């Protein structure tokens, strides 16, 4: 069944200023980069919210290790590395990204066995 | 499988003016309160949309009874009371909240047996 | 389990200008129409993202054929026709729509056997 769900909104211009946690692949895909980086930030945050959300009342247990990979058609897929890849070993992650005007968003759903 | 999904956007400043349906726990968690109350409003609305959405072509069958509980780390979890707690007795609710600038949002997924 | 998830944001005023892919039922339901058409556009896009998202690294395989039907209470439900109805034959689609101020959004989750 479902482990958790997360959603995130990111202000693109504010994110652009803040960045001045991403893989080479992400940075490559992004480079108008702010839009793309902001939606990848939202996606990492959605994944975190979905997982951490499943650990209600537990002590918390990262951003670079949640990688949005894109295929040749630009479809997003999450690839995990590091300590979170261990924790979410049997978990399937579904994500979707959007950016419209000044706002990026993402949703993630984690699903296990 | 999945019962339904809901999403909701809430304008924070407009919500702030409108409020001038929340539990003591919610009101406590919220108190900058408008942001927090708006995302809790979005979460209640997402839950309603997910459930009611599963009743296509049926006569409709509440906000205080959909409580966003937070743990010591601020993770959200829905607790139901009242008549909706009866209707959704076997249903697991997954939620996620966000607020960025003037906009709050929430997503809910209901899952049954 | 889950096939995919999609999310979409649509600027309502920009969408209104762009439209100047919808069924008679959708156009009827919509007619302040821009708001309603924008959320239906977001819903079609979310469905596409959820399905196409499940085809990572595959060659892509439409908008009129993803119909948001509403019941007498305005609950949304997707009805498929055409080539996508074939491709998604065994797939259950869950959707939710929202529009607040200048922004519409939608989320879709596809679920199979
Ligand atoms: O705006 P943000 O994207 O920061 O989202 C904030 C929301 O994330 C949720 N959240 C906070 N910590 C969380 C965690 N560890 N896991 C999942 N969700 C969380 C809360 O609902 C919070 O809103 P609140 O503080 O009004 O409850
Ligand atoms: O903007 P809101 O958050 O009010 O969302 C409105 C959408 O909720 C959806 N909705 C309306 N009633 C609903 C219900 N009872 N259950 C689930 N979703 C519903 C509709 O898609 C509506 O948009 P439309 O009127 O353009 O179809
Ligand atoms: O803003 P949009 O609604 O156009 O969403 C764009 C996102 O959709 C996603 N996307 C693009 N093509 C896609 C497809 N065929 N299926 C699913 N998602 C897709 C991408 O993550 C893209 O953002 P990026 O270009 O920053 O990676
Ligand atoms: Mg956030
Ligand atoms: Mg975009
Ligand atoms: Mg805005
Ligand atoms: Mg609403
Ligand atoms: Mg916030
Ligand atoms: Mg879009
Ligand atoms: Mg609306």
UniProtKB/Swiss-Prot annotation, chains A, B, C:
The protein's role, per its UniProt record: Transfers the 4'-phosphopantetheine moiety from coenzyme A to a Ser of acyl-carrier-protein. Involved in the post-translational modification of Fas-I and the AcpM subunit of Fas-II.
The name this protein goes by in its record: Holo-[acyl-carrier-protein] synthase
Subunit field text: Homotrimer.
Manner of cofactor binding, per the entry note: Binds 2 Mg(2+) per subunit.
Subcellular location: Cytoplasm
Species the sequence originates in: Mycobacterium tuberculosis (strain ATCC 25618 / H37Rv)
Entries under HAMAP family matching the protein: AcpS
Additional observations: Was identified as a high-confidence drug target.
Positions bound to CoA: 40, 98-99
Gene3D superfamilies, per the entry: 4'-phosphopantetheinyl transferase domain
Gene of this entry: acpS
């Amino acid at each position: 069944g479902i482990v958790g769900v997360g959603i995130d909104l990111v202000s693109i211009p504010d994110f652009a200023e803040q960045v001045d946690t991403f893989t080479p692949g992400e940075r490559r895909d992004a480079s108008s980069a702010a839009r793309h980086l902001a939606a990848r930030w939202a996606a990492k945050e959605a994944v975190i919210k979905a997982w951490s959300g499943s650990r209600f009342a537990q002590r918390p247990m990262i951003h670079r290790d949640i990688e949005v990979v894109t295929d040749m058609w630009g479809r997003p897929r999450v690839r995990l590395t590091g300590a979170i890849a261990e924790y979410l070993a049997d978990v399937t992650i579904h994500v979707s990204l959007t950016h419209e005007g000044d706002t990026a968003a993402a949703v993630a759903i984690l699903e296990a066995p």
